[PDB]
Design a protein around this nucleic acid. Structure first.
Lengths: 55, 120, 209, 113, 122
RNA sequence: GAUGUCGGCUCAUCACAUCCUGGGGCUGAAGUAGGUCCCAAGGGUGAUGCUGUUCGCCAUUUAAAGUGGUACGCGAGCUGGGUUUAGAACGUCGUGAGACAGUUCGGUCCCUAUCUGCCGUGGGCGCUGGAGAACUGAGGGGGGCUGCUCCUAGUACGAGAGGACCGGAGUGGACGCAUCACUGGUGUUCGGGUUGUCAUGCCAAUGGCACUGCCCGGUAGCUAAAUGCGGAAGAGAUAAGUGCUGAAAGCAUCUAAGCACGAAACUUGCCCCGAGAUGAGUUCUCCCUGACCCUUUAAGGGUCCUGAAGGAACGUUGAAGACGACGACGUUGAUAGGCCGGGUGUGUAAGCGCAGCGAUGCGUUGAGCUAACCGGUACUAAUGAACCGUGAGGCUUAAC
RNA sequence: AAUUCCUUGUCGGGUAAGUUCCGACCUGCACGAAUGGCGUAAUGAUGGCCAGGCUGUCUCCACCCGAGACUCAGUGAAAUU
RNA sequence: CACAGGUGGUCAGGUAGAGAAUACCAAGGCGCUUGAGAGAACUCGGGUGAAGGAACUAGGCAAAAUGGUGCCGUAACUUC
RNA sequence: AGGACCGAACCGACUAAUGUUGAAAAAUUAGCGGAUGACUUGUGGCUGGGGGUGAAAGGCCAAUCAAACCGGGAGAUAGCU
């Protein structure tokens, strides 16, 4: 049910050694708008493949 | 297991999914583009695109079937009068899904789904 | 003897004229190309390594492409080895076909069994369920006890618990060879073999006989 | 499954009569009595048809010698020698499992015209 | 599939109307008895002046089940109820002299050729 | 300043003083069967009526229904019938309050797991240039049961009754593993019937809601009750046992020298895992062979150019899966959806005609629909990029 | 017997098999006549027992439907040490 | 506690229905102040099961089953 | 007519599960009992601690009961920890 000794700060750190996030490293650049976006996602201005799809 | 099964249950009961996709297909027909979660699109295709393929041929029986599936006479009329003719030569694939980022309140994969022609 | 690498096609039946239905697994065994011969001098044991099927050229990484290039054979979907007996002998590039099994009468088929995911002890190990009623509290399919008491003070290794089931290598031995159809590259064996449709099978003449 | 398809094709009978559930059929099945091979008729009402290519089957229900019996004949078996239709029944369902709870007059089937 | 506590009908004129399976004999932990298997029963219901009286314990052979039998063809034969023939406890011979209802070819085994010969069908 | 009681349940695990099956010696062992002792733990070793029961007593099995240890194994797994709170009553004892291992009825079972342990499944590094495969097998694990029938052979044996050894063959039971071809189950993602009620203006046709409203069927998948398969044969070393030659100790004597046999134990053979086997192995293939500067000067650091084999990421996904992982596929493409054709399932859709007063029937019509199935098909989505990963790999000594 | 320790008394019934039950016997450890005896229609969320029906209680589990569990984003405890 | 609990009175429409039961609705009011995915074991709350049918268990606990109206018919016993 | 019967409101609370750091310091869900009565409820009043009240259970008397709560004697006492 519950611990029988206080775990150390070392064991917090060890358990959390897997908690780090991963960055994208990987922004794609649209052909026409030239702006960065997430691979396979439309851009902020509505482009994808280099065509307006939203406007 | 889930081997070879189809259909997301989307954390809903069957009645709820059926009602929800009826509404969402009506929405897509009348607006020609809607914004929804990525998993709810990709389930709209299995619902909407059969409606267009049904609307290819106009008959009373077909319209009554469409009305049964989409209890919306305006939607039925738009299917049979605009989308039927518009997609007459296309072999399925009437819609198009565009990933569009994440929702702000729940970090939900969001997507656009639209008719491929969309008056353009 | 060596065996052949095939693919599971499905199951069906054969009706024999005296009115017996024989369930069969249809294994197609295309030509198996020998891509390497291992011997005592170089490798420390006797074996042939085969390939089979076909693979898209854009998917063949050039390490594999060079390996297949040496043997002068086309890329297959994989490589498998068969230890060689004392009399057997093949050569690189030799194509071995199904009529190897023309007169065998028993094969051992090896495949990867269907994957059942994380399975409970009831499904994984046939544990008897506890009572559904009569006061049972939240303990219907649960495993029950797992050890004795203070004196072992531990759970013995190899205890049967829940966990991953299936998706593992399985051999069924001594299957009757119902028909060997050379023209279609078909082997028909009586009974069921591990795996799903479309999975690889290793078919060898029965060891135990 | 092209290859299983034709493996099965090579092996289906070609003369299976058309019948429907509700029809009264007699089925001639081969019976071997040691050295002798004999032809025995089992006649009844088709209550179910499982039609799956080579794996087709049909269930025939009988009232024999006091109590009901039903055989599930595997169509395309060489045991089944021949199937013949004695009368054509008019039913609306595809499975007449409700006939298991009927007997006598309550089990009658209208003839199909 | 006849197990302990199953109620069977009696397909012979030995007098019993209902018998209850008491032991599926012929193996340790053996669960079920199909057509052709010897079970041991108790008699639950008998006609007044029969050759066996209610409460007797004796053997019997299952001649009809409604789980049925599988023929080598793959076909299956089912009945609408389970029935057995009472057998003398020491020499497994029928007690009756008439057999009612069809029986099945699984009895042709030199041990139940009496039943086959007396049966009205199959 | 709390170490939960019995039995059942669910899981066990070990010992051997062995219940069965296996080997053998002696018999007051003719055979069949025993009795007794020795060796042997590989596997197996009932479900019920009564009672809270272990037990016991039954009634039927079985090859056998072992005996103990394990906090009389097991309540952070379950039960709580009994025991052992507070209510009540009986017999009994006490003047009484009350009491009785006397009885009787009724009577709150908490825990989201930190650590060890265990079943699964990953990340990091290492393995000495990196990579993609394919292996070896050191080690572990799993399995390792038995009935009945027939032949040998009514032969041996026996006065008859009875009835073999040994050697083979075929079918079972329990058990395990795979599977879904069959036979079935389930199938709220498919079709039909039907009740009440509300809606679509209404008729008709439909939809909602009433547990999928109630149901009747049912595709795929999954599954057992369904169907295939398997526990070995063979080795090697032996146990009890039996011997051979053979002295000590002219004889003898299985042992002291030497030589054989001999069992489900042991080691293999069968199957699965497996080089973190840091003792990190092997085999094959693939890729990278530009400069410059500074200092402790060294397996030293930086700069510019270059980035390969591959890998990851992202997307479309899967009979893969909690998540990772794993496998397929990304336009040179069938990876998924859709579409097309088929199959399957339900069973003759709507609309119209006709007959009938009508409900309804009939024809058009086995029609219409049909999910996860099968064959196709780029119609939609799978983007050129980018990212990571480098630039020839230490030293020593031998050999060449 | 809500009472009998011995005791699962004994005998009969009911079961294939019955320490319970039901009917007897009397050998009442230790019933008994308003701290009532004995019976009793009806009645009881009363106690025991036996049938038929009925079924996943079980032989023995299989599948589906939902809510959690699992993963992602926001928030964010506890016993204990 | 913006807590699944407690809290007297009054009004009360339609269609089925004996009904203020219940089903579905009207007027009116809401969708319950975390959501999005996946579709593991196991837990909870359901649905359905072949053959059997209480073999379960302390004990049929739980589940399943029965169910309405008219009419026919109805036992021992009894304080009628 | 009836401490009649069946059955909502209403008033109870026999059984099972769930919950047990709860939605809740006794509830929820599925059944269950009574339901013209010895009924149920509203509003006020009255009874007080060795006292009340009790269709009786050592029940109840503000989540407290073999003697309420609050303040005082009082820093009772404690060969005990």
């Amino acid at each position: 049910a519950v611990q029988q000794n206080k775990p150390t700060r070392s064991k917090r750190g060890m358990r959390r050694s897997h908690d780090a996030l991963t960055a994208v490293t990987s922004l794609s650049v649209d052909k026409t708008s030239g702006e960065k976006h997430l691979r396979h996602h439309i851009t902020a201005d509505g482009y994808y493949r280099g065509r307006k799809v939203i406007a | 297991m889930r081997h070879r099964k189809s259909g997301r249950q989307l954390n809903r009961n069957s009645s709820h999914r059926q009602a929800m996709f009826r509404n969402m297909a009506g929405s897509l027909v009348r607006h020609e583009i809607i914004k929804t979660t990525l998993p709810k699109a990709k389930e709209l295709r299995r619902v909407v695109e059969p409606l267009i393929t049904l609307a290819k041929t106009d008959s009373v029986a077909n319209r009554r079937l469409a009305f049964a599936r989409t209890r919306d006479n305006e939607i039925v009329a738009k299917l049979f009068n605009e989308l039927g003719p518009r997609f007459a030569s296309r072999a399925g694939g009437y819609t198009r899904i565009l990933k569009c980022g994440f929702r702000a309140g729940d970090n939900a994969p969001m997507a656009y789904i639209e008719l491929v022609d969309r008056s353009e | 003897m060596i065996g052949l690498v095939g693919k599971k096609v499905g199951m069906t039946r054969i009706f024999t004229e005296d009115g017996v239905s024989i369930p069969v697994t249809v294994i197609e065994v295309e030509a198996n190309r020998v891509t390497q011969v291992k011997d005592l001098a170089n490798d420390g044991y006797r074996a042939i390594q085969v390939t089979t099927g076909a693979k898209k050229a854009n998917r063949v990484t050039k390490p594999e492409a060079g390996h297949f290039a040496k043997a002068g054979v086309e890329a297959g979907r994989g490589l498998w080895e068969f230890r060689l007996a004392e009399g057997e002998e093949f050569t690189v590039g030799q194509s071995i076909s199904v009529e190897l099994f023309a007169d065998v009468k028993k094969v051992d088929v090896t495949g990867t069994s269907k994957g059942k995911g994380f399975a409970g002890t009831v499904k994984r190990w046939n544990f008897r369920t506890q009572d559904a009623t009569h006061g049972n509290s939240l303990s219907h399919r649960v495993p029950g006890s797992i050890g004795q008491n203070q004196t072992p003070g531990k759970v013995f290794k190899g205890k049967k618990m829940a966990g991953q089931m299936g998706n593992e290598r399985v051999t069924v031995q001594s299957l009757d060879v119902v028909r060997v159809d050379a023209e279609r590259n078909l082997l028909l064996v009586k009974g069921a073999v591990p795996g799903a449709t479309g999975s690889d099978l290793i078919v060898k003449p029965a060891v135990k006989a | 499954s092209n290859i299983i398809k034709q493996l099965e094709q090579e092996q289906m009978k070609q003369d299976v009569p058309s019948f429907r559930p509700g029809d009264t059929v007699e089925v001639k099945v081969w019976v071997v009595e040691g050295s002798k091979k004999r032809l025995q008729a089992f006649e009844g009402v088709v209550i179910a048809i499982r039609n799956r290519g080579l794996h087709s089957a049909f269930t025939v229900r009988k009232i024999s010698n006091g109590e009901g019996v039903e055989r599930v004949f595997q169509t395309h078996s060489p045991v089944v020698d021949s199937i013949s239709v004695k009368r054509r029944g008019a039913v609306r369902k595809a499975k007449l499992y409700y006939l298991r709870e009927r007997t006598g007059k309550a089990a009658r089937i209208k003839e199909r015209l | 599939m006849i197990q302990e506590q199953t109620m069977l009908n009696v397909a012979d004129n030995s007098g019993a109307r209902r018998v209850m399976c008491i032991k599926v004999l012929g193996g340790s932990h053996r669960r079920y008895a199909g057509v052709g298997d010897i079970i041991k029963i108790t008699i639950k219901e008998a006609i007044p002046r029969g050759k066996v009286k209610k409460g007797d314990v004796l053997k019997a052979v299952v001649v009809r089940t409604k789980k049925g039998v599988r023929r080598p063809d793959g076909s299956v034969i089912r009945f609408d109820g389970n029935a057995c023939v009472l057998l003398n406890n020491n020499s497994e011979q029928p007690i009756g002299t008439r057999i009612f209802g069809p029986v099945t070819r699984e009895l042709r085994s030199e041990k139940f050729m009496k039943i086959i010969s007396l049966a009205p069908e199959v």
